[PDB]
Nucleic acid binder design. Structure first.
Lengths: 169, 169
DNA sequence: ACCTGAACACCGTTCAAGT
DNA sequence: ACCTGAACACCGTTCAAGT
């Protein structure tokens, strides 16, 4: 009997072992000894499946940050994210694609978490979303590039550029 | 007789008309009445072809910025980029993918152009590259999200956050 | 409910062979 | 030089039918 965490575990193993291009619905059915159209009972499509793989990826990226100042909130969040991504082959491409799809709920949670920190820094209520997104655009972009180069930090510099744009309200 | 600008013109028409998912080597050979393995004489692969399509996309995004202050340099560059991208279906996904591939020479030119502006603002010589990349991570991320939502600004807010992180040296 | 069989409509890339 | 034919080794998704 096949259950969703079966699937996500197996696809994660494919990602770690072979990269995001070898993560295909057919190959994933091959590692579970099932028919490719089996997976479509549990997931609506490869997008939803990859979003689940992103959530499983990022279970370790959520760190508690409420008893910390609004700069340590940001830095600590972004550090935890980047370290969750750098721990899986093409982790940052996968999570970035799920964020552009709309299929990782915890990447949305992390954007809420840093939106709170942007608020707590003085930006107006109507510009909070824009800011938080700004931050994650940066760290997703950065880790994609970084994981590229590695597979063939001064992360803090680019991040501090943003926390300074934020210092001014 | 088939020449590279033939190809790039035709693929651009496919992108405008149908989106980046319908831009496939086979479909592109179909619009040129050629065999799919014809395109592989002129381009090494779909990556190189898409980089060429990105360069043709971004011929309009280069604006002259040497007789302007280092904030108008940034704002003007980023405005020109975002407007070149928003003028083509999935323009920002295409250009973003070519930037992650390493196959648009003018996206590299734009990163040089804003690297100069970051220099001219006081950041150290060893942190210039990091900064410029930071900027384009932001505007590529932003326009991807924006073009998503449109197909189904407060750009300036996120950008000013960065030019303020930059004000401090 | 949950999965198989089998099809539908495609992909990128290569490469001998023709002109 | 530049292109065709034809193959190689794949894709995501659907859906009747079985259990």
């Amino acid at each position: 009997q096949l259950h969703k965490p079966d699937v996500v575990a197996a696809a994660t193993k494919i990602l770690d072992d072979h990269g995001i291009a070898d993560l295909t619905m057919r190959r994933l059915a091959r590692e579970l000894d099932v028919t490719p159209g089996a997976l479509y009972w549990h997931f609506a499509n490869k997008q939803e499946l990859l979003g689940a793989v992103a959530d499983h990826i990022l279970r370790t990226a959520r760190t508690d940050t409420a008893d910390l100042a609004w700069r340590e909130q940001i830095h600590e969040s972004c550090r935890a994210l980047r370290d969750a991504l750098l721990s899986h082959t093409d982790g940052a491409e996968l999570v970035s694609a799920s964020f552009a799809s709309g299929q990782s709920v915890v990447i949305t949670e992390i954007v809420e978490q840093l939106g709170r920190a942007a608020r707590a820094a003085g930006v107006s209520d109507a510009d909070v979303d824009a800011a938080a997104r700004t931050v994650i655009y940066y760290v997703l972009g950065f880790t994609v590039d970084e994981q590229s180069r590695l597979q063939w930090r001064q992360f803090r510099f680019g991040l501090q550029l943003l926390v300074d744009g934020l210092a001014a309200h």
